[PDB]
UniProtKB/Swiss-Prot annotation:
UniProt GO molecular function: DNA binding; DNA-binding transcription activator activity; DNA-binding transcription activator activity, RNA polymerase II-specific; DNA-binding transcription factor activity; DNA-binding transcription factor activity, RNA polymerase II-specific; DNA-binding transcription repressor activity, RNA polymerase II-specific; lipid binding; MDM2/MDM4 family protein binding
Chain's role: Ligand-activated transcription factor. Key regulator of lipid metabolism. Activated by the endogenous ligand 1-palmitoyl-2-oleoyl-sn-glycerol-3-phosphocholine (16:0/18:1-GPC). Activated by oleylethanolamide, a naturally occurring lipid that regulates satiety. Receptor for peroxisome proliferators such as hypolipidemic drugs and fatty acids. Regulates the peroxisomal beta-oxidation pathway of fatty acids. Functions as a transcription activator for the ACOX1 and P450 genes. Transactivation activity requires heterodimerization with RXRA and is antagonized by NR2C2.
Chain segments carrying region Required for heterodimerization with RXRA: 101-230
Record's note on what induces expression: Down-regulated by aging.
Organism (species): Homo sapiens (Human)
Protein's recorded name: Peroxisome proliferator-activated receptor alpha
Domain NR LBD stretches: 36-263
Assembly, per entry: Heterodimer; with RXRA. This heterodimerization is required for DNA binding and transactivation activity. Interacts with NCOA3 coactivator. Interacts with CITED2; the interaction stimulates its transcriptional activity. Also interacts with PPARBP in vitro. Interacts with AKAP13, LPIN1, PRDM16 and coactivator NCOA6. Interacts with ASXL1 and ASXL2. Interacts with PER2. Interacts with SIRT1; the interaction seems to be modulated by NAD(+) levels. Interacts with CRY1 and CRY2.
Gene name of the encoded protein: PPARA
Amino acid sequence: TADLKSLAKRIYEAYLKNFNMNKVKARVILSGNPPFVIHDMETLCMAEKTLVAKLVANGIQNKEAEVRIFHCCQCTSVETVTELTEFAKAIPGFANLDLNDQVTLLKYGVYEAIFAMLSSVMNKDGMLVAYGNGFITREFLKSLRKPFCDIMEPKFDFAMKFNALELDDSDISLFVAAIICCGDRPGLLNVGHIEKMQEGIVHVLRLHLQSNHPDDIFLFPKLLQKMADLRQLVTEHAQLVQIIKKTESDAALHPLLQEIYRDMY
Ligand SMILES: CCCCCCCCCCCCCCCC(=O)O
């Protein structure tokens, strides 16, 4: 229907406006200011001097490479949280929710959305970083000292299967909106209204996938399962972050992310 197709287009346009990275932009870069390839410590350190110069301007006081990398991971998440917060305003009913419910939905949804969207910048060999200006290899990330080598690999595993679904930005935008609209998040004040907001977005997602992916009759339930898989990926990620927090004193957690993780798992 015109209203439902228009809603899907709205959410797609809001996604293109609000996220610095989209799947088309990522694919243009990945196909070959080209991205600097980070595949070892030499190339990490060269990339840092150009792309995150302040982080390595401290001489012998610079942090360990793994800690610098984790800091850059967190800065990326902080920026994506800001983008997701603006995007959520395009979702029918979201801005009409109580301010506290908006906070709760974003708190529990952002990392699920982050890992879903991260797939768009990942291939089997590595991922784009730093606003598309670096490509860091999967093998380099696996080579880091424990526990830091354990951060990205499960996200690559998720992404390879997610990317095999061959979603486009029009699908991913609605999937991210659906992640944000979960009525079963803890602490919600108006569950009923959130459930109806969820039902509306999920209806739009179902119809859109039927229209955009006529070849895959299971795509909607596949994506419902991916949402559950993302919840488990995030719980596991939070457990690893808590290990880092307890055992890696140099790996300072950004305060916005500390609040997101607080009282989550
Ligand atoms: C010189 C640039 C080095 C870049 C280092 C890798 C950046 C990865 C960005 C994606 C991070 C995904 C994981 C987020 C982790 C978290 O916020 O808890």
